[model samples]
Target chain A: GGMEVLDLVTGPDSVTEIEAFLNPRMGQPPTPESLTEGGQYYGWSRGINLATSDTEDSPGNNTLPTWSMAKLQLPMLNEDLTCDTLQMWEAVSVKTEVVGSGSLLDVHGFNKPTDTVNTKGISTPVEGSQYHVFAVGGEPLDLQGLVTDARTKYKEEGVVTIKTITKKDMVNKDQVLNPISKAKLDKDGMYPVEIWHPDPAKNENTRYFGNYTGGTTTPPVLQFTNTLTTVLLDENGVGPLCKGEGLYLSCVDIMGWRVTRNYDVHHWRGLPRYFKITLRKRWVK
Target chain B: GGMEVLDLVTGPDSVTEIEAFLNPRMGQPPTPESLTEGGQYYGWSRGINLATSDTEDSPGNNTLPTWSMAKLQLPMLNEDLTCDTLQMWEAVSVKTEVVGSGSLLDVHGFNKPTDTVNTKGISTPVEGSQYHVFAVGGEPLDLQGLVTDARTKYKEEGVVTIKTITKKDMVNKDQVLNPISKAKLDKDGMYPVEIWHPDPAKNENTRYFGNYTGGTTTPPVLQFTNTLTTVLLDENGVGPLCKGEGLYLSCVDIMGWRVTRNYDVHHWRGLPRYFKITLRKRWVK
Candidate 1:
């Protein structure tokens, strides 16, 4: 026996009301008294009334007209049902073409610094500055420590390193942020670098230090050094400093100093933007 | 009529070069002036040369040898093209298995403490330290306001009295972390504890207060009372103090005292790690 495609949809004329439960207005108020009634008779009256309604002021026809109107007409029997047993399955394919344009911070609402100066003179935060509210601290650990530690501990033991470069770095020179030169990067060591400006507005302390490539350039890149073993570390200790916990660093910068003051009242900085990273060494059986 | 499996592919010999445009070396340099040159004959020369290449080097074989060389060979055409249209769909299932060991810090490059002693009388980071660098941070928040406010607000909502405990007290003979006995922990109330070895080498302050189930035992555990909502707070005040942001705490220990020396320098004490936890009650809506 071989498999063949079976059409569960019987015919254009054969139809049934599969959406009785979905259209709440089609059913009588489900209460303690109607427990014995099944799907066939439960919402039949409302369904038929809705199907036959033609005018604009029809009662119980509040919901927008749907395919169910003509498809679920009178003779509300299971005549459309076929004898063959059928199983339902779902299938999908998603090809996402993300026209990625900005940094991780940009995607989340933070704006980058602009070369175009505003009327106030001091470079304004571009056009979308007003919406720049939600911002999370960048992971703040240095990558050098992990790379150095791994090489010192394992290189003599014959482990080989495979380097993976980000796609962004592969194409643009400005996107390169490795503190160490390419020649000096150990082939036997893993050195993952952040290839995009994590916080472009705060250029001095940009997380994942690299220039923005806009959408014209390739996206965030990651290079991997394939090995039987790989050593790693969180660059920014934003968290899980201890067991079973996570470190989250976010702040609301609702108020800050402005060169052009329009406010008459003074507001103090509510909370100092304090941040830290934690590390630990533990032993287990 | 019953549905039959239709061969949308037609007969296999309906051939065309699907990858003609992908090979950049083919065709004259793509210029704006040649917009109408079309795909049919633009890269025809390169495509035919590549199609006829023998066992060795050929003009169209400039790309470095890859895994795709031997796979997609002659008889590449699909003569199954039909006048009747066709549709395509897909389905898939994914199962993921993650062996979760080590804290988030471990995956990010911080090595867990070790048992074996080295020449310097210090146990280096353990063998798996290399793989430990891919970790993420656990969430962090403040403890002060939540504990005080929750206690004040809910202490009279018929909410039973709750007593917080430290890890040290939990393991000691007193079992002071629990105001009530183990039997009463199930009562509708909130009980939070502080767990950590303030000094591991000294075996002093270990958080997650319960009997250390270190391999032979069932390490510290947590119990919860459902519905009646339990609130937790970290005493160290290292985070989420109020409704808005959080406080962070981390330290580095570069030096400390040593027992012996061959005129050597010992950097034993690392970071003086302090951490905490907190929970609260709020309208989630």
Candidate 2:
């Protein structure tokens, strides 16, 4: 929408009008702090101005725009001035007047002017991956047929990519296996479970151990109904990861700790790296 | 001491002297709210008196033990009491005279006048059993090494058995490699590693999760850590106890939070139970 209006006002004839909003400086200046104690609640209040010169035909008059009766409603502009000055106030008043004409957003071709929105197409695929899958005595995860059920749901609802890793081979072998190996586990005994989401914001989220906080009612983070933790035979066992090293089974990064789910997996130091996914969209001029 | 002295004085024709030191109650009741205004530190005074009666030789005098002299002094009892009435002061002075001459704790072995004084013990044990015992986990607590090291340095170092409960072997199975039964897996999964010790004082205890009062650290009661978890898997590739029934961990009677080796486990709860613990004889009995 901003692009549409900008296109309409980009001609040479509109240079004077557009100059009021354009940057005349050589380079970009630093942005002001957003949370400053400014008197206004929103952005800081600033003003713009533009000046016009008299034409040769109206040399004696000296003013190309005449100060007629209508001139009382509008003020003349100067090259530069503060918001408190006449030229700056005149520019502000003109901007308000343009909005009052009832074509502000419509002229710019904006569909929704009052909200921020994001949409995913029905064909877009949803993705889920599982790692560190362990079983007591080599038992299987009773996905409650969850894998097949989830696959069917994904086909019916949205596209998805499902990945599952198991510790079947490493059982009782004293061999350390991680979902991803590029990241090194530090001496602090933290194993990273790496998550690379298609969304940039979720690219490298990590988690610690998985378990209840203290009580059975709920966990402090990333809680699953019946988690299957194999005996961590390390010298510290699972103690350093789950208790001392700061890990919880009850947490969610996407919801920002506000909303929680029944099942989740937490790592000790960091999360296992599953995949690095990228998505793209096309824009036509 | 009081009992033995009373017995000697009560013997027939054997009452040589009856002496006790008594003082009038002297202090105002304490205000529990403010320490500055409390009687624990204010309005206190004490007085002592002695009395004598020569009754063995006097005929008409038949002298009954009577008040002889009252001696008052500062800081006599360090107690909070104030004599508000003359009657109260007189009663206190008279009582002191009757009991102030070493008659309470001193006993004569024979009725005849002899310089033989027997000192008696002040207190005796009350009847009843005391002390508490708590349970210990199945895994060998490695504190033995630390205890042994400390014992070499301090002979007085001792620990009382706070509480103890016999843990019975629930189950054990390693026979079936692939076709492990459900009960076998469940029993193996029951490691009984973590235990809970809830805070008796609700807000005063540690917390793992709650509305924080704007701080960096999570409170004690709301916090818990998973110190132990089993790693073995069943034949079907599932956790032994992973049938959605949830994990079963060890727990304290009332304190419901999981134990970290440090804060949650070792810290005492409200009204901690007492039990006969090994200690130096000088300190114990």
CA lDDT of every candidate: 0.18, 0.15
Give the residue spans of candidate 2 off by over 4 A: A1-182, A187-285, B1-275, B280-285
How well does candidate 1 score on lDDT at residue B202? 24
Model 1 has a DockQ score of 0.01
* Residue-by-residue lDDT tens digits, candidate 1, B52-135: 333332222211110000011122121344524322210011111111011011111222211113221111211110100000
RMSD of each: 37.3, 39.4
Q: What is the TM-score of each predicted model, taking all chains together?
A: 0.16, 0.14
The best candidate by TM-score is 1
Q: Specify the CAPRI tier of model 1.
A: incorrect
lDDT of 2 at A43: 12
Each candidate's DockQ: 0.01, 0.01
Scoring model 2 with DockQ, what do you get? 0.01
Each model's chain A TM-score: 0.15, 0.14
lDDT of 1 by residue, A1-285 (tens): 112323333444332211111111112322334556533322221221111111111212111111011011122223333524332211111111111122122222212223224423233221100000111111221121112111111221222211232221121111111223121122211222111112221211112111111111112332223222211122221211111122122221111111112111111111112222222222111
